Amino acid sequence: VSQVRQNYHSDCEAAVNRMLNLELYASYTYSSMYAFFDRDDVALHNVAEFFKEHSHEEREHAEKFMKYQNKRGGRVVLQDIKKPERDEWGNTLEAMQAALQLEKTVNQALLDLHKLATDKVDPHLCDFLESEYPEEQVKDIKRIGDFITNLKRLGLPENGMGEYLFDKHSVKESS
Amino acid sequence: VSQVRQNYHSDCEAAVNRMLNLELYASYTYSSMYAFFDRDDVALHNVAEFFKEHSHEEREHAEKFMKYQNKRGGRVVLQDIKKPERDEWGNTLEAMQAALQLEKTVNQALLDLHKLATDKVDPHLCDFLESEYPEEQVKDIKRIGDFITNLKRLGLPENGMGEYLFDKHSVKESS
Amino acid sequence: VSQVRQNYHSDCEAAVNRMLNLELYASYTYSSMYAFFDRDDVALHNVAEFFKEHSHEEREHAEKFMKYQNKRGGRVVLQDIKKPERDEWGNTLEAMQAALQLEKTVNQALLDLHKLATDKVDPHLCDFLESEYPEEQVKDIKRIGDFITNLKRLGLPENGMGEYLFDKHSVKESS
Amino acid sequence: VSQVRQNYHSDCEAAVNRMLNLELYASYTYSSMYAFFDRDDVALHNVAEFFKEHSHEEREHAEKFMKYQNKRGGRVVLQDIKKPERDEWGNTLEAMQAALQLEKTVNQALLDLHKLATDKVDPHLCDFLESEYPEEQVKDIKRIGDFITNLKRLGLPENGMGEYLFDKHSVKESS
Numbered sequence: 001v002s003q004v005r006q007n008y009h010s011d012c013e014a015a016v017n018r019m020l021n022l023e024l025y026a027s028y029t030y031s032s033m034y035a036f037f038d039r040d041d042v043a044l045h046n047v048a049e050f051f052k053e054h055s056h057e058e059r060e061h062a063e064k065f066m067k068y069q070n071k072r073g074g075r076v077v078l079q080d081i082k083k084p085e086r087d088e089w090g091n092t093l094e095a096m097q098a099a100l101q102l103e104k105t106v107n108q109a110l111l112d113l114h115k116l117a118t119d120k121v122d123p124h125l126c127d128f129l130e131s132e133y134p135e136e137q138v139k140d141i142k143r144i145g146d147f148i149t150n151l152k153r154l155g156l157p158e159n160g161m162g163e164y165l166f167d168k169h170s171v172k173e174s175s
Numbered sequence: 176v177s178q179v180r181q182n183y184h185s186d187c188e189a190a191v192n193r194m195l196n197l198e199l200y201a202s203y204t205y206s207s208m209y210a211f212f213d214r215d216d217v218a219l220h221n222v223a224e225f226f227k228e229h230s231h232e233e234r235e236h237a238e239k240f241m242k243y244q245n246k247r248g249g250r251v252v253l254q255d256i257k258k259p260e261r262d263e264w265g266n267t268l269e270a271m272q273a274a275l276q277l278e279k280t281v282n283q284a285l286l287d288l289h290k291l292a293t294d295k296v297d298p299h300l301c302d303f304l305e306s307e308y309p310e311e312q313v314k315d316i317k318r319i320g321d322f323i324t325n326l327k328r329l330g331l332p333e334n335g336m337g338e339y340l341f342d343k344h345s346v347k348e349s350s
Numbered sequence: 351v352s353q354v355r356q357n358y359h360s361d362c363e364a365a366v367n368r369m370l371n372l373e374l375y376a377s378y379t380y381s382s383m384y385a386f387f388d389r390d391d392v393a394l395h396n397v398a399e400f401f402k403e404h405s406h407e408e409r410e411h412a413e414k415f416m417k418y419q420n421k422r423g424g425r426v427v428l429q430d431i432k433k434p435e436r437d438e439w440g441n442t443l444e445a446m447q448a449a450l451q452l453e454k455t456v457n458q459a460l461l462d463l464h465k466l467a468t469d470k471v472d473p474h475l476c477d478f479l480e481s482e483y484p485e486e487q488v489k490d491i492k493r494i495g496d497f498i499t500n501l502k503r504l505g506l507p508e509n510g511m512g513e514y515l516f517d518k519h520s521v522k523e524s525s
Numbered sequence: 526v527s528q529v530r531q532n533y534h535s536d537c538e539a540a541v542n543r544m545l546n547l548e549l550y551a552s553y554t555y556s557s558m559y560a561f562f563d564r565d566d567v568a569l570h571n572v573a574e575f576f577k578e579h580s581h582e583e584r585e586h587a588e589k590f591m592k593y594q595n596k597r598g599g600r601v602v603l604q605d606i607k608k609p610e611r612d613e614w615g616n617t618l619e620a621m622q623a624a625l626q627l628e629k630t631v632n633q634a635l636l637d638l639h640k641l642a643t644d645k646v647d648p649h650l651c652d653f654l655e656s657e658y659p660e661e662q663v664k665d666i667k668r669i670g671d672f673i674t675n676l677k678r679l680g681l682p683e684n685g686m687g688e689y690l691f692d693k694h695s696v697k698e699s700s
């Protein structure tokens with residue numbers, strides 16, 4: 001075992017690798033949503049940029065898990081990054097609904113990792129997870145839910161004017 | 176009696192305590208409206224912030240009545256702060272209608288206190304009331320009425336797009 | 351249930367509402383202490399301002415619980431804010447003793463909420479509570495205890511000179 | 526009658542002259558308190574300066590009544606300025622007690638003038654009185670009462686240490 005390793009269970013090490021992969025998969029999904037909203041026949045560029053930002057933040061989280069793994073003396077083991085579920089994402093409402101579900105999936109994986117860390121009496125891992133994530137993850141879920149509520153109010157999916165307006169007012173003006 | 180007391184009738188002292196309580200009750204109502212518009216299934220954050228601001232201003236008025244009471248040599252006597260009338264506030268139009276009524280209630284209480292002060296020949300109290308309030312209170316009533324007119328124009332309660340637009344254009348961009 | 355809700359037990363949601371109420375009640379108690387020390391026949395204005403500051407901080411904590419409730423998909427349910435225990439607070443020593451007890455009461459309520467969150471395996475709620483509170487709450491208890499020790503050293507309740515001096519040196523110079 | 530005169534009753538004009546005189550008399554009393562606390566066998570220089578400031582503010586009020594009289598088309602009629610009641614003022618507590626009474630006397634004269642103005646249906650005079658005075662006068666009475674409370678707490682008249690401390694901490698550090 002690594003000379004640095006202390007109080008780091010093999011099961012936790014493995015779960016950290018799986019979380020790293022899930023973050024990479026979430027990044028890649030959000031990148032697909034960006035590409036979709038950038039299409040000439042979609043053309044909602046602030047929505048696109050929102051998803052791009054999220055893609056970059058999830059890749060940053062993956063990198064933090066890599067660094068954490070090494071700091072504890074575990075070993076990074078990479079797997080394929082699965083392509084997203086869909087090739088096209090319908091409209092702003094459907095994409096936001098898919099994002100909500102993705103964020104909930106990631107949150108559940110973090111909850112599960114925290115439970116594992118707790119059961120293995122690893123307070124360092126618990127602190128790490130409670131110091132990069134739960135706050136940020138609940139805030140992202142909240143924001144997406146707020147957006148879904150507003151998209152429904154705006155008459156999505158049918159009301160194209162409403163969709164247009166969402167892109168101008170709800171998401172930050174981009175690039 | 177207090178060594179500072181001069182020309183301060185017991186009835187006025189009591190009415191000042193009741194006004195303090197009413198201001199605290201109004202604050203608390205506006206705080207409830209904030210919380211409602213912050214809900215994920217409401218999600219009108221500029222509207223929420225408008226109500227939050229109003230909540231803070233009414234608490235500041237309560238504090239001014241406390242200070243006034245002591246300056247005159249009366250004694251602050253606190254009562255329970257009753258919870259708001261409603262737990263949920265419907266939509267922007269219903270909330271604004273409720274605010275209009277609340278503001279009118281507060282204004283009537285101020286009018287009544289001014290009449291009492293007049294009848295007790297207390298020009299200091301009259302001046303105090305005419306120097307923190309009537310101007311500001313009539314302006315708040317006017318603004319809420321203007322908003323109600325605009326919400327009706329925008330098709331509330333049915334027109335969700337209209338509601339959405341009100342939050343972007345009528346109330347100051349927030350937090 | 352709310353579209354955002356995940357891993358948030360009904361009992362926790364309810365306990366968050368009760369904590370919100372307790373914070374509002376603590377705020378209101380401290381506001382009463384301010385008003386008392388501002389009286390012309392008390393007249394310890396730095397002491398008064400200390401309590402005013404504490405009143406504002408407890409209201410800010412209540413607002414944080416409101417926001418938290420919504421972020422998790424729970425529903426804010428407000429109750430009456432009970433008036434303080436006393437209408438008059440004796441002197442600096444008695445007020446500080448009452449504050450000590452109030453702070454301990456609030457701390458116990460936070461401890462109890464943390465135990466509940468732990469039992470419901472809600473690390474997000476535990477982190478929230480451990481990230482706004484325990485540090486600050488133990489520091490406030492310590493400061494009030496330090497003050498009580500100093501008030502006793504200064505000869506309270508009998509030694510008015512000592513009381514006078516406390517207001518000039520122990521609490522920050524105010525307004 | 527003066528070409529400017531409108532709605533200005535002779536009785537009000539006369540009462541304005543008497544108020545001018547009372548303000549000059551109050552100024553002169555406070556000047557005597559200054560001189561007393563400046564004595565080598567009294568030697569409380571911050572207390573002295575407090576009274577000096579008050580003397581200057583009351584002379585400024587007298588000048589405002591002069592200007593007001595002319596603005597309304599009345600005629601300034603001066604009388605002797607009576608010397609103060611006492612030649613020596615005992616100690617800080619006795620002087621503050623005398624100031625409290627003086628301030629109350631002035632306030633009562635203002636109240637009486639406001640009642641007269643009201644009875645003569647002179648809103649300009651009422652506004653003038655409510656715009657230079659009641660606020661400031663109640664605040665001065667409050668401050669003096671606060672000081673009396675503190676002087677008693679400090680053990681006046683017997684406790685010279687307490688008196689000494691009051692001059693260092695209660696009144697602004699002077700000249």
Ligand SMILES: [Cl-]
Nearest residue numbers: 005006007008
């Ligand atoms: Cl190990």
Ligand SMILES: [Cl-]
Nearest residue numbers: 008009010011
């Ligand atoms: Cl192991």
Ligand SMILES: [Cl-]
Nearest residue numbers: 064067068071
């Ligand atoms: Cl790390």
Ligand SMILES: [Cl-]
Nearest residue numbers: 085086087088
């Ligand atoms: Cl597809």
Ligand SMILES: [Cl-]
Nearest residue numbers: 101102103105
């Ligand atoms: Cl998913």
Ligand SMILES: [Cl-]
Nearest residue numbers: 050170171172
């Ligand atoms: Cl955004």
Ligand SMILES: [Cl-]
Nearest residue numbers: 180181182183
């Ligand atoms: Cl009275």
Ligand SMILES: [Cl-]
Nearest residue numbers: 183184185186
């Ligand atoms: Cl009375």
Ligand SMILES: [Cl-]
Nearest residue numbers: 239242243246
């Ligand atoms: Cl005031």
Ligand SMILES: [Cl-]
Nearest residue numbers: 260261262263
């Ligand atoms: Cl309701």
Ligand SMILES: [Cl-]
Nearest residue numbers: 276277278280
């Ligand atoms: Cl009402």
Ligand SMILES: [Cl-]
Nearest residue numbers: 225345346347
């Ligand atoms: Cl606004």
Ligand SMILES: [Cl-]
Nearest residue numbers: 355356357358
């Ligand atoms: Cl849940």
Ligand SMILES: [Cl-]
Nearest residue numbers: 358359360361
């Ligand atoms: Cl549940």
Ligand SMILES: [Cl-]
Nearest residue numbers: 414417418421
């Ligand atoms: Cl929060």
Ligand SMILES: [Cl-]
Nearest residue numbers: 435436437438
């Ligand atoms: Cl009591």
